[PDB]
Structure formats: C-alpha cells, structure tokens
Amino acid sequence: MQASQFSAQVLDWYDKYGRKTLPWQIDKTPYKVWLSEVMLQQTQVATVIPYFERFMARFPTVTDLANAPLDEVLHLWTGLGYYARARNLHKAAQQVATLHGGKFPETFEEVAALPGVGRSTAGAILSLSLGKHFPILDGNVARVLARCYAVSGWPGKKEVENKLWSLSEQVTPAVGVERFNQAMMDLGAMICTRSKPKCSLCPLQNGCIAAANNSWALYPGKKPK
Numbered sequence: 749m750q751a752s753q754f755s756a757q758v759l760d761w762y763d764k765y766g767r768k769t770l771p772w773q774i775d776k777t778p779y780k781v782w783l784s785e786v787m788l789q790q791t792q793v794a795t796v797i798p799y800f801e802r803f804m805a806r807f808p809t810v811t812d813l814a815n816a817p818l819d820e821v822l823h824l825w826t827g828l829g830y831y832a833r834a835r836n837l838h839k840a841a842q843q844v845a846t847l848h849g850g851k852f853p854e855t856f857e858e859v860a861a862l863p864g865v866g867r868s869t870a871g872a873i874l875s876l877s878l879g880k881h882f883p884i885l886d887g888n889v890a891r892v893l894a895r896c897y898a899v900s901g902w903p904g905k906k907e908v909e910n911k912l913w914s915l916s917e918q919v920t921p922a923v924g925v926e927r928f929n930q931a932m933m934d935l936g937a938m939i940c941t942r943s944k945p946k947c948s949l950c951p952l953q954n955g956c957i958a959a960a961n962n963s964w965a966l967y968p969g970k971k972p973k
C-alpha cells in the first residue's frame with residue numbers, strides 16, 4: 749500500500765468513526781494537547797478525562813500551573829500514577845513561564861526542549877493543536893506501522909526505531925495532519941491492539957502485511973531473550 753493510499757484511507761476512516769469530541773479536542777491549544785498527551789502516556793483515556801477536566805479548571809493556563817506549588821500539582825495528580833510525569837509537567841510549565849513569557853511554544857525545538865516532552869510528544873502537540881507537519885510515533889502508532897509494513901525487529905533497537913520513524917514520516921500527510929495523527933493513535937489504541945487486533949474494523953486491512961499473513965503477533969518484534 750502506497751503512502752498516499754495509507755493516509756487517504758486513515759483520513760476517510762477518521763471522518764466516519766474517529767472520536768473528535770474529547771475535552772482536549774475542543775478549542776485545542778498547545779497547552780491542552782500537551783497536558784492531555786502527558787496524562788495519556790501511561791494512563792487509559794477513561795481514567796484521564798476527570799483529571800484533565802480538574803486540571804484545566806484549576807489551571808486554566810500554563811502560567812497558573814507554573815505558579816502553583818508542586819505539592820498542589822502532585823495532590824491533584826493523585827491516582828494517575830507515574831508521578832515523574834507530574835514533576836516534569838510542573839518544571840516544563842515553569843520553563844514556559846520563565847523562557848517563553850507564559851505562551852506555550854509553537855516551534856518544535858522549543859517544545860522538545862521541555863522536560864517530559866519527547867520527539868513524538870512535541871510532534872503531537874504542534875500537529876494536533878496547530879496542524880504543523882510533524883509525524884508521531886508512540887507504542888500504539890509503532891504497532892500499526894510495524895504490522896502494516898512487517899517490521900519484525902525490536903523497537904528498542906536504534907535501527908528499528910529509525911526505520912519506524914521513516915515509515916511514519918512517509919505516511920504522514922501535511923494536509924489534514926491533525927486528523928491523521930489523532931486517527932493513528934485511535935487505531936493503535938482501539939483497533940490494532942497488542943492482542944487479537946480487530947483487523948476487519950481496520951482501514952488498513954486491505955494492504956496490511958500482518959493481516960494478509962495473520963502474523964500480527966510477530967510485529968513489532970519483542971526484546972530478545
């Protein structure tokens with residue numbers, strides 16, 4: 749399946765089935781996308797929604813989050829687990845207030861410079877909130893790509909990771925990137941699951957290698973032992 753076909757089929761799918769009404773999808777801003785991405789990294793969406801709403805109410809802007817005492821941030825985070833995310837979240841908020849005048853950065857370099865923000869997250873923030881042309885690659889997106897293009901190596905390996913980043917770059921369009929990237933995350937989270945993927949409900953089923961050979965269990969490769 750060519751790249752043009754890949755994005756086109758994903759976009760058509762998103763239009764008809766994709767969720768576009770979550771709290772962090774309404775009146776999107778870099779701040780809301782960032783906050784949600786960090787909460788979603790290690791936590792299920794259902795659990796995240798109430799916390800996101802509580803955070804946005806208490807911290808309407810990044811400067812409000814920055815000026816707040818860390819103890820208050822951790823108290824509100826209670827129940828989400830993986831508190832390192834919270835600690836970095838607060839530091840990043842303070843970095844935005846200090847270095848960027850309270851305006852969450854809208855350029856890749858500045859975003860990726862924040863604590864707790866990686867290449868994929870920075871790309872997600874700018875693409876989802878401003879439509880900037882950046883590809884993403886988290887565990888969910890990587891699984892979809894690895895299966896579709898049969899990448900059997902372990903993503904923990906440098907060459908494999910770079911290979912997956914190349915594939916994401918190839919299929920990610922500029923036109924409609926905000927929709928494409930959200931769709932990819934949705935597919936990997938709801939359709940292309942680790943176990944028994946719902947291939948019949950997948951928009952890439954007609955070109956996916958793993959589906960053609962019923963070999964989804966081989967991709968991505970597991971850490972050798």
Ligand code: SF4
Pocket residue numbers: 892895896939940941945946947948950951952953954956957958959964
């Ligand atoms: S067809 Fe199946 S294995 Fe392939 S990307 Fe879709 S859900 Fe994953």
